[PDB]
Design a binder for this molecule. Structure first.
Ligand SMILES: Cc1oc(C(N)=O)cc1S(=O)(=O)Nc1ccc(Br)c(C#N)c1
Length: 167
């Protein structure tokens, strides 16, 4: 038994809730929150900017030190950093950004990073301002992640569309 509440069961291991991932992280303080990162860990907008804002920019400060030491991530890759006030850890995962010309096949590789963690709070990857179809992202998630994933979908009209079209 874990502390996630109000989620709809999608599979044996995938759950989905119409909620704001930041407000969810603040309430649950999960072991792992996933950030929809870019390879530079530049948290301007989307989930990244919202998570970073909720950390009072501490996420960005830590991220800049990480990049200065290690260089950029790979598209499809990840790194584990602090969760600051939101979670024990933040798993920064780089899903391909369609609008930037990044290959969509890399979405499966991105979701494979989730399998290194028993339980995660996560957004959908590669959707929103990353430019790919959210129904597709949910399908890849369900077909790739084997650990327990709690998906927070803030967009009300999208949440309903994802549930109603889920096979
Ligand atoms: C409001 C919304 O729209 C879509 C869509 N395909 O239009 C997804 C979402 S989300 O907020 O619920 N989760 C989410 C996940 C990842 C990213 Br990156 C963003 C952004 N930026 C948002």
């Amino acid at each position: 038994v874990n502390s996630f509440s109000g989620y709809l069961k999608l599979t044996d291991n995938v759950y989905i809730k119409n909620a704001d991932i930041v407000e969810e992280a603040k309430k649950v303080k999960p072991t792992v929150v996933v950030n929809a990162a870019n390879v530079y860990l530049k948290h301007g907008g989307g989930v990244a900017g919202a998570l970073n804002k909720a950390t009072n920019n501490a996420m960005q400060v830590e991220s800049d030190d990480y990049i200065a030491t290690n260089g950029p991530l790979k598209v499809g890759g990840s790194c584990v950093l602090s969760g600051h006030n939101l979670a024990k850890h933040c798993l920064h995962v780089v899903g391909p950004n369609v609008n930037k010309g990044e290959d969509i096949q890399l979405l499966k590789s991105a979701y494979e990073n989730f399998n290194q963690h028993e339980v995660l709070l996560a957004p959908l990857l590669s959707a929103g301002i990353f430019g790919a179809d959210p129904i597709h992202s949910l399908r890849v998630c369900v077909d790739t992640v084997r650990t327990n994933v709690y998906l927070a979908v803030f967009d009300k009209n999208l949440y309903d569309k994802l549930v109603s079209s889920f096979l």
